[PDB]
Design a protein around this ligand. Sequence first.
Ligand SMILES: CCCCCCCCCCCCO[C@@H]1O[C@H](CO)[C@@H](O[C@H]2O[C@H](CO)[C@@H](O)[C@H](O)[C@H]2O)[C@H](O)[C@H]1O
Ligand SMILES: Ic1ccc([C@@H]2CCNC[C@H]2COc2ccc3c(c2)OCO3)cc1
Ligand SMILES: *[C@@H]1O[C@H](CO)[C@@H](O)[C@H](O)[C@H]1NC(C)=O
Ligand SMILES: *[C@@H]1O[C@H](CO)[C@@H](O)[C@H](O)[C@H]1NC(C)=O
Lengths: 541, 117, 106
Amino acid sequence: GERETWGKKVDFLLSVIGYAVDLGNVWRFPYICYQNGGGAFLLPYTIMAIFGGIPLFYMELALGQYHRNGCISIWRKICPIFKGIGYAICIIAFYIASYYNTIMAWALYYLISSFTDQLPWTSCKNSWNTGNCTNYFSEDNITWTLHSTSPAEEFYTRHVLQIHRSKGLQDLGGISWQLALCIMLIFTVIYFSIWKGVKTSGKVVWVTATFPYIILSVLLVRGATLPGAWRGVLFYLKPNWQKLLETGVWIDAAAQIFFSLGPGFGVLLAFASYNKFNNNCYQDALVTSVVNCMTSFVSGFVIFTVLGYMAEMRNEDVSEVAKDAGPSLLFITYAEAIANMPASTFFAIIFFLMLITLGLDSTFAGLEGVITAVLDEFPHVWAKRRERFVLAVVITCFFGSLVTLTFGGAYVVKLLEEYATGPAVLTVALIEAVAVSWFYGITQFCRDVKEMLGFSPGWFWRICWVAISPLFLLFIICSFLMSPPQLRLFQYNYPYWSIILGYCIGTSSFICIPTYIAYRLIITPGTFKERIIKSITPETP
Amino acid sequence: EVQLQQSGPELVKPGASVKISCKASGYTFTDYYMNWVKQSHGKSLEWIGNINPNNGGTSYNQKFKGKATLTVDKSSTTAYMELRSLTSEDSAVYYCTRSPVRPYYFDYWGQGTTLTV
Amino acid sequence: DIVMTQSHKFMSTSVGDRVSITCKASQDVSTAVAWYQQKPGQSPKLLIYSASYRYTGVPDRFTGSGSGTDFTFTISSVQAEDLAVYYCQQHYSIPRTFGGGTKLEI
Ligand SMILES: CCCCCCCCCCCCO[C@@H]1O[C@H](CO)[C@@H](O[C@H]2O[C@H](CO)[C@@H](O)[C@H](O)[C@H]2O)[C@H](O)[C@H]1O
Ligand SMILES: Ic1ccc([C@@H]2CCNC[C@H]2COc2ccc3c(c2)OCO3)cc1
Ligand SMILES: *[C@@H]1O[C@H](CO)[C@@H](O)[C@H](O)[C@H]1NC(C)=O
Ligand SMILES: *[C@@H]1O[C@H](CO)[C@@H](O)[C@H](O)[C@H]1NC(C)=O
């Protein structure tokens, strides 16, 4: 019917590859790989990708390609008792569009400020830097006070963030203007890129998702020439077979592969809903998983050879400088590293452009997925003015993200990252996989997969669809639900009330699923057996 | 000019425990790491662990994971390290010393007390 | 761990000669090596850190160099008050560790 397909198959492939990659393949994978096992981390990562990420990825991709509906309108034809998946996914996408875009705003501010022969973090001879200055080493004579900070750390904590004026999480300090202008610009770009649909989203992804790879290759070629750039490569490739015995390494690998491939979310499904019918969605899923793994691998290479160059110029044992867990690894350490190299300006520009284009495509994909979901759900009041209500959802994300644009917004973005995403999306994906496999029927799903492309998958894919991925997801949820994380940021410890607030925001999306199972039987009442058999049966087109 | 006080020796019986203090006099208490290090009778030095006086953080050795635990107090200007599971092989002189952040050299040491069994 | 191996615990010479000791590292260490002086009975005394920079309160007699794995701690014209068990400590990685040292004869 009116299914607006892509220009070419390579267009959808590039769009989904862009949705796959993000900052999390640069700031998270190398750090987690170094912490959990070192060089030997590749084995559990690849195992949990083969068993945990690729199966759910391909399952939801083929499901959305077959049924041709959004992540909310598909439950009418899959399992009407679980229509709250769409609403929970919209809530999670709102939380992400709120917190994640602040990283893009910071990167854009860094970019627009880096247009100077003297980088703003190569010397602290500025107004914001205080007497606690200790410039880059350049020698080993200088001693370091316990409170002494590098010029890039000072620039990141006082000027681009303005976090020194945060006297407590109970208040915010005030919304800054520079970060607000950068986020206004980036949201305007998002709105002018996702207004029409996949037709122009695919045209902008052609330069949005391909630009990170050329910058990554340039940075890798640079890292292949830096002095002492082999120490970091050796730390990245030094295996530790003893660390693999621990279960925390496997938990970290599973969490990383899940939040890198992003399976069972509702963007792959919304994209495949616009894909062709007889298209080979198996090869696409395979090549996307492979290219995401290879992108994470190359990003680990480049990041750790940069840290190795730093540990050669500075003191070695990169773990001494790689203490910041989060985006600070790209904002503090990498800034120092680029500042020490000659002609730092060009490399700063290309690196921050790589960050901003790694964020752009991911935000495009998420917002396009949620927009396609809400459009497929209400195609009468909406879908007549598609370019409308997109400005409305953009202003909604802006109003949700203004709380992160304050002076102490780093605490807010960390709280939203580590609490508003994990358990909610994991339980959502788990019960979605149960609905598609157990409730909807694994045999029926395999029959639809066979009829769609022309051949049914093997018994191994069925095992991964019915038992392996469910146990994987439930293992992750029971691991994350049994260890309340006392996370901190810049020595700002989070009290227990912050943990309660994070837990409340976390469940603020899952409860929408019981909402529908509660307020759906009010129109189809009756006995218990008739209701339990009417909730499971799908729609009859 | 800068002295590092310490506790006194004690004939500790096998099974009991003992803690040793330290006083950073001459330089500020909360601007450099207060490391601890051990050496047996006529043997080599063995690092015990690191402590952060500003936030009470610590980073102990892998040979003293549960064997030793350290605490600090910037109000009383002390460094209380707790030693448990004492024996004869682990009973010798201990040292308290200062160290800045990431040149990691031990500038000034205490007078040195021996925890003999 | 990163074991700190040095010369023999007795390799030394008489008074007024060129004393040179080495400190081999299991892992390649660029400059993260220090040198402490253990006078008989007392605490170790820091002399040189980063393998090429003598800490304050030092006579010009103490010297030292080296990089990668072998660090050359050289000193000539030794006096009667500079004979002590010189330990070799590294700044490389946690858990940090010291060396063995060497007695001075004669
Ligand atoms: C049953 C329905 C769902 C109930 C939901 C209840 C709300 C739960 C609130 C969040 C609970 C903890 O949430 C989860 O915490 C873990 C650690 O504990 C975080 O995990 C974090 O620390 C762990 C260490 O264990 C690292 O390995 C990991 O890389 C990092 O992300 C997750 O990012 C977060 O998702
Ligand atoms: I919980 C969660 C966290 C991350 C992910 C994906 C994992 C890898 N690929 C990108 C990322 C996509 O996540 C979004 C990004 C921007 C967005 C968005 C969603 O919604 C609108 O703006 C999925 C679920
Ligand atoms: C460095 O910061 C600490 C605490 O933030 C402060 O106590 C100290 O005085 C500062 N140093 C200088 C030189 O301002
Ligand atoms: C740094 O220390 C060395 C010690 O070998 C000294 O020669 C040099 O003059 C010092 N540089 C300074 C103080 O700028």
